[PDB]
Each structure stands twice: as structure tokens, then as C-alpha cells.
Amino acid sequence: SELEKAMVALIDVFHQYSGREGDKHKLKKSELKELINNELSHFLEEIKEQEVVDKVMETLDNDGDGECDFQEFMAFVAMVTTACHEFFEHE
């Protein structure tokens, strides 16, 4: 059942923050970072300092190299995870 809550769990995160200007379905350095430091204050891992995040969100910048939407963050938690969490999940 986690697959159902975890799935929408991600969506809600972006659907809650992303969508302030009007177009929605996109997140800027302020929308993502703040959110991360907002939801992930004790368990970041994928986000260390403030400067790194900017590069982090940029490392996934696929849309227009401008900001990160739902597809950019979805690939993030997945890319960052699927890679290290793979065998690094232990350490």
C-alpha cells in the first residue's frame, strides 16, 4: 500500500508548493530548496548546503534549465536514491 501513498506523497509535495505564480507544474530554487529544508530538515542527504542545492536542482534541470517541476523532482528522489540508496542504503 506504500506504493499508493508514496506515489501521491511525492505529487502532493510538488502540487502543494509548485503552483504559486499561475502556470504551476514547476519549482524554482526557492520553491524546491525551502520545501526540502521544510519537509527534509532532519533527513536531507540529497541536499547538503544552500549552494549545493542550486547545483543539485540544476543537475536535473531538464525542463528549460530554469526550474524543477514534478518530473524533475521525481527523477531526483529517484536518481539520487536508485543510485546510492541501491548499495549505499546500508551505510
Binding site: K55, L60, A83, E86
Partner: peptide, 12 residues
């Protein structure tokens, strides 16, 4: 992807 973290440039 294993130890490359797969991110891209940030961690490389």
C-alpha cells in the same frame, strides 16, 4: 550509477 550517484555534475 552505483557509486556515481547518477545525479550528474553536482556529485559527478
Amino acid at each position: 550509477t552505483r557509486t556515481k550517484i547518477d545525479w550528474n555534475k553536482i556529485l559527478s
